[PDB]
Structure 1
Amino acid sequence: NLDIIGKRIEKIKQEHETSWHYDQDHPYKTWAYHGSYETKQTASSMVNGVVRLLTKPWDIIPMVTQMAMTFKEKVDTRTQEPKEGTKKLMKITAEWLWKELGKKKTPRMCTREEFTRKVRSNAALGAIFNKWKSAREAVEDSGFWELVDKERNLHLEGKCETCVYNMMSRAIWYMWLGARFLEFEALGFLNEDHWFSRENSLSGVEGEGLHKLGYILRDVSKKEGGAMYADDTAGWDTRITLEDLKNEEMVTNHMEGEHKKLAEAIFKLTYQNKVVRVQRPTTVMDIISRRDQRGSGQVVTYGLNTFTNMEAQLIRQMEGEGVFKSIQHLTVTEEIAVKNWLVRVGRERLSRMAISGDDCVVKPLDDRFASALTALNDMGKVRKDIQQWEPSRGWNDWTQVPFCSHHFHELIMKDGRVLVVPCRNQDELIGRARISQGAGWSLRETACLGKSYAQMWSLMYFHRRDLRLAANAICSAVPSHWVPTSRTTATHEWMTTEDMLTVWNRVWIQENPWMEDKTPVESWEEIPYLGKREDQWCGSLIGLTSRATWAKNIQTAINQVRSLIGNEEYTDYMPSMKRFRR
């Protein structure tokens, strides 16, 4: 308690000595509440006019138009301490899983240099504005780094002063850039050296890319076993127990020297104890603390979520195989048997899973997994939208399984080669491309974001008739040489000015390890669509009057956006399609 957080609290109290007050009508039950002080401030989603003017039929689809308008009663919940049998299962599995991840990897500190290059090329590192303006500025000023140095030597002492969370089914805890550096210094290796790559972790898909996920699920399908299970957790970050935070910290057991102590301090002082500032309109700033739940860099969050999810799903698999009888208490011979299962089949059981943070797909040995619920519920990883003790509904077809907001189609090219393509409801795809985050967008920057979406659609969603046409129209309407941009940057092969047919050939043919014949595709017309009926099932407007008029008159929409942008160099991409090829 206050021995570890007091200093951080004491320091904030002093910066607001003219305001401090222990409010008696504080809404916190599960969060500890320490006091309040005076503030006054708020970021809404804006429409991209380039994308909207080239997708007119969707102006009347409420699923699209509603996305652009606009649970903190889940963060103030509490999760029970697992039973002893659960606690033992988790420690043994965690110990074994860190060893496995570490067999071909070396933990190591990430560098000021590495950190600097990151900020000088926009990765969403969730920092805050206030002594400097942008993050780009603070990284060049050597004053900053003295602040970093001060805190860093404080962490080696086992104390913390400036590492304080700022809270904003989503909640994003920004820290000041310096606190983000110290987190990145200690744990960045997990992301930077790909600890959750499929090759290294067997279950993971870090760095895989949307054009690989389908092929990965198809490979899991090829295993002998039961249904494929894809249970989402209800508010995963709110269900991370102090016992989970402690099993995560065991990665420090693989470290040394300074690194080991820096990592230990990040775990002890920012993860297993937290200080947070929250806005309350009643607008003051509440300073509250707690020990448990997830609150870290969104990137260290991803990796530790993958880790703990891998762990939970191996244990749920153990329960289905009757490796242990009861979560109440493991016997001495039950521990040997758990350890022995891990040594004997653990790697095989990891390969039976695709895990992306809180998202999983499991193909267990058989369907006993479906009703193996005691460990999963006792770890606090309670399934969304099913009664606590109701058996999981499995999927019988890998092409129906949900994963990372997608499903996957098998699509046979006119030459017999097999593409596995990602897909989702086209209303979702169009509604997201029509949205921009932030203010101060020039027409030119708005147009280059539109173009990033168009090139993504050409690479990932080429098989959707409406998105290949809209993508061709956007790339026709935006100057040929203007570079695609994004403000909150998987593998993003569409972020390039290279020819999209050439990138398609690289991604789907040349670099695709599931394609034996490497014959390049010579034109876009060799590249197939879904069946007409499947395209409509997944949200196509093909067959509507509105869509027929849009398609037929597309050159008039393209010309409207060209006229707005002005007299620039443009390419006509519409003759890459058969119907416009005269």
Structure 2
Amino acid sequence: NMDVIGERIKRIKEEHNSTWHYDDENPYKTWAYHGSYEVKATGSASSMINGVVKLLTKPWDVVPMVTQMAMTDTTPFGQQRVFKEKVDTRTPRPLPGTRKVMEITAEWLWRTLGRNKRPRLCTREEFTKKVRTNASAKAAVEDEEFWKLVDRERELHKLGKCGSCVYNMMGKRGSRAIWYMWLGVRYLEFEALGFLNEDHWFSRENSYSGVEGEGLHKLGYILRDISKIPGGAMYADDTAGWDTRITEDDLHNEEKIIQQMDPEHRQLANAIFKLTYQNKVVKVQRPTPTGTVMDIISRKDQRGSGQVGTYGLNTFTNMEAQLVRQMEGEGVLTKADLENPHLLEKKITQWLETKGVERLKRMAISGDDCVVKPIDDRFANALLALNDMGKVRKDIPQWQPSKGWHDWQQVPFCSHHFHELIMKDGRKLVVPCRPQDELIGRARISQGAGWSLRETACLGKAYAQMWSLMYFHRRDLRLASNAICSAVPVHWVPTSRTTWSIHAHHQWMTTEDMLTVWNRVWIEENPWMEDKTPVTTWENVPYLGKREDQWCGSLIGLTSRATWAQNIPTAIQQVRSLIGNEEFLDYM
């Protein structure tokens, strides 16, 4: 194992020769520990509050979920706590028959996903464009010396060696050299595996089960379309710590995509798979009585959560795992088959070739998140292969049948559920939703410290406009959104981001009129909206039924909420007076 990771550790140990030591009381049980060195503490025990959103959401000052979200611990203490809970475990090896079905399915699945698209290398110019369009990283990309280090590392990869590709459990911390090595490792991963994302291999059209690039505003419509397929209930089982359950067998199956690559691409992707996925060197902060140390650890399995290929590879493995579970529910795979090291291939290949694509269409898969509508309910108790592959469901005994839903509107997916609304004109909309306290709690969080009232107000406007576009059907959020937009100067451009979710298309990151953007998203560009008649007033943009809004957390009907609603122009004026003599519009 040291032959692949040795060079990386040597460079770290040499760079930190002053404080390098082997801490005898390191807490690592399933990860190989190499040593430690002193570091300045990274992270915070609490999150900074967005004063603009807080001032305009006074009734949520008395709400428990809002307080919890403001309490994210990212300090070395917090890092170690999560590590012990989840990360420091071993997944039992799947049985020989299970490994055979997984291999057959992975091979068939990669061929299916590659039917129209050819893998390709991604470029310095693409990486540069993505870094620029999103936004330290933008500065590194402009530096020619960053790219010469990338070239030097790439030459080692071509030789089957790695010198600087090290993953971090936290954030960035002589200082530009360590940062260039991190961003350079992300570039090389992007160059070799970025095609999965850049060329939309997991789009619904390409992958059948995937939803990559679809967007939050389409997810509900996709669940409603799956609901029309004849079969059993819709299942949406949560896996306990999916990334920790990715096995050596899963990684071997994922690597199969290299077979479809050109020789020059295959060499680079083979280097990413072998040196950074199947072997990894990780940095993790740890508090000590003396201060704070950085631990250097390694392992041969599990998924690195913050990697370019993580989303696509998790989606791939979950599509494979759910097809295997569907085969088991259908009686194609028995307990005897899973234990069998001489399992017959024939029935598996026949099911995949005749039913595979149809079975993929019964699913919505996004990383570890899945919804499956199997042909019948035998799937509920078909748990042998699911547990054996290591994808053990969260907070339920291993062998208790899964509970499915007979209404797509009750199905959890991507932290949301979806409602069908009827507009005043009779047209139907399918909208995303979640418990309201989660939406308000998140909008009240400002990421980082040392932010002016301007940057704070602009992030507040970004949240308000996200509510106008995605959660307009929630009475309190439409009201709060109108209040925030009335308090923030009309010409101020929303900055930073409301979410890192892959489903977010950030249509709210604009100073274009929100009703114009709403019509474009929900009417004009909506493929499930046959009648393109525009909505000319917010009065014609619908709400959830009052009862559903309350079931989803609305404060409508409470006296404190009626008080807030009555007194909102006052709070808006207070924000305006502190911002100054700028141009404001009254959205109330």
Give the TM-score range, shorter chain: over 0.9
**Would you say the 8 A contact 2:281–2:298 is kept in 1?**
yes
**Would you say the 8 A contact 1:43–1:438 is kept in 2?**
no
Please give the residue correspondences for 1:49-198 in structure 2 after superposition, counting only pairs within 5 Å: 49-70=51-72, 71-73=82-84, 74-122=86-134, 134-168=136-170, 176-198=182-204
What are the superposed Cα offsets for residues 509-536 of structure 1, whole Å, 9 maximum, x if unpaired? 1111111111111111111111111111
Q: In the alignment, which residue of structure 1 is the partner of 2:16? A: 16
**Would you say the 8 A contact 2:232–2:376 is kept in 1?**
yes
How far apart are the structure 2 equivalents of 1:135 and 1:463? 38
Q: In the alignment, which residue of structure 2 is the partner of 1:559? A: 573
**Would you say the 8 A contact 2:123–2:191 is kept in 1?**
yes
Q: In the alignment, which residue of structure 2 is the partner of 1:434? A: 444
How far apart are the structure 1 equivalents of 2:28 and 2:353? 45
Among 298, 311, 324, the alignment partner of 2:320 is: 311
Matched, 1:2 2:2: yes
How far apart are the structure 2 equivalents of 1:214 and 1:510? 17
**TM-superposed deviation, 1:297:** 4.1
**Would you say the 8 A contact 1:314–1:350 is kept in 2?**
yes
**Would you say the 8 A contact 1:29–1:76 is kept in 2?**
yes
Please give the residue correspondences for 1:517-528 in structure 2 after superposition, counting only pairs within 5 Å: 517-528=531-542
Q: In the alignment, which residue of structure 1 is the partner of 2:27? A: 27
**Would you say the 8 A contact 1:455–1:494 is kept in 2?**
yes
How far apart are the structure 2 equivalents of 1:110 and 1:296? 21
Among 331, 345, 369, the alignment partner of 1:322 is: 331
Matched, 1:494 2:508: yes
Amino acid at match of 2:545: G
How far apart are the structure 2 equivalents of 1:284 and 1:67? 27
Amino acid at match of 2:471: Y
SS at match of 2:133: coil
**TM-superposed deviation, 1:278:** 1.7
Deviating more after overlay: 365-374 vs 15-24: 15-24
How far apart are the structure 1 equivalents of 2:478 and 2:471? 7
SS at match of 1:522: coil
What are the superposed Cα offsets for residues 83-138 of structure 1, whole Å, 9 maximum, x if unpaired? 11011111111111111111111211111111111111337xxxxxxxxxx11111
Moved over 6 A (4+): none
**TM-superposed deviation, 1:330:** 6.1
Amino acid at match of 1:32: A
**Would you say the 8 A contact 2:189–2:308 is kept in 1?**
no
How far apart are the structure 2 equivalents of 1:459 and 1:548? 24
What are the superposed Cα offsets for residues 208-236 of structure 1, whole Å, 9 maximum, x if unpaired? 11111111000000010011111000000
**Would you say the 8 A contact 2:35–2:295 is kept in 1?**
yes
SS at match of 1:288: strand
Matched, 1:385 2:391: no
Equivalenced residues, count: 559
Q: In the alignment, which residue of structure 1 is the partner of 2:405? A: 395
Amino acid at match of 2:219: L
Please give the residue correspondences for 1:447-526 in structure 2 after superposition, counting only pairs within 5 Å: 447-487=457-497, 490=503, 491-526=505-540
Q: In the alignment, which residue of structure 2 is the partner of 1:578? A: none
Amino acid at match of 1:557: A
| Aligned-CA RMSD value | 1.5
Amino acid at match of 1:96: W
Amino acid at match of 2:586: D
How far apart are the structure 1 equivalents of 2:396 and 2:305? 29
Among 288, 301, 326, the alignment partner of 2:310 is: 301
Please list every run of 5 or more consecutive structure 2 residues that lacks an aligned counterpart in the other structure.
73-81, 172-178
SS at match of 1:512: coil
SS at match of 2:413: coil
**TM-superposed deviation, 1:21:** 2.6
How far apart are the structure 1 equivalents of 2:15 and 2:403? 54
How far apart are the structure 2 equivalents of 1:281 and 1:221? 50
What are the superposed Cα offsets for residues 430-472 of structure 1, whole Å, 9 maximum, x if unpaired? 0000001112222111111101111111111111111111111
